[PDB]
Amino acid sequence: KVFGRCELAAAMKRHGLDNYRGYSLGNWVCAAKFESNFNSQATNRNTDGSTDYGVLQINSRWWCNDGKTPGSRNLCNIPCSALLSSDITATVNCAKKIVSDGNGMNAWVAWRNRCKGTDVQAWIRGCRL
């Protein structure tokens, strides 16, 4: 499923991401845009044998189990396939854990390269929230 920009923002707000750990909603929407372009089915193979899944491209080495990543620890305790859902609940719950893992939102390379330090409020422009 490919969400509309404001469609995802609203869904994220409903799930408590606005200002979570002091990160405004714009940051999360900007991260999803650059990580997956709002496509819940997005997957990326990593030259290292791990894979990134979903709208927030969560990694199989530590966060979810995909049954093909040597030395995986499943910290979010879910199958990675649950991250390819049109329901972002699993993605959000896992994201909250990742963002509190000690590197802030730097955990998302796309957010760091394209969102960090910019005017992130542009990302929820036109949205009724």
At CATH level 3, the topology is Lysozyme
The major beta sheet can be summarized as: 3 strands, antiparallel
How large a portion of the residues is in β-strands, by DSSP E?
5-15%
Count of domains: 1
**Helix amount, in percent?**
25-40%
Largest sheet strand order:
1-2-3
Distance between the termini: 21 Å
**What is the correct CATH architecture?**
Orthogonal Bundle
- Overall shape: it is globular
Tally of DSSP β-strands? 3
The CATH class is Mainly Alpha
Compute the number of helices.
4
PDB class: hydrolase (o-glycosyl)
Keywords: hydrolase, glycosidase, bacteriolytic enzyme, hydrolase (O-glycosyl)
Assembly: monomeric
Entry title: bobwhite quail lysozyme with nitrate
Summarize the structure.
The chain has 129 residues and is mainly α. Helices cover 30% and strands 6% of the residues. The chain has one domain: Lysozyme, CATH 1.10.530.
How would you describe what is shown here?
- Pfam families: Lys (PF00062).
- It is found in: Secreted.
- Its EC number is 3.2.1.17.
- InterPro entries: Glyco_hydro_22, Glyco_hydro_22_CS, Glyco_hydro_22_lys, Lysozyme-like_dom_sf.
- Strands 1-2-3 form a three-stranded antiparallel sheet.
- Strand 1 and strand 2 (51-53) form a beta hairpin.
- It has a single domain, classed as Lysozyme.
- Helix 1 packs across helix 2 (25-36).
- With 129 residues, it is mainly α.
- It has helices at residues 5-14, 25-36, 89-99, 109-114; strands spanning 43-45, 51-53, 58-59.
- It is globular.
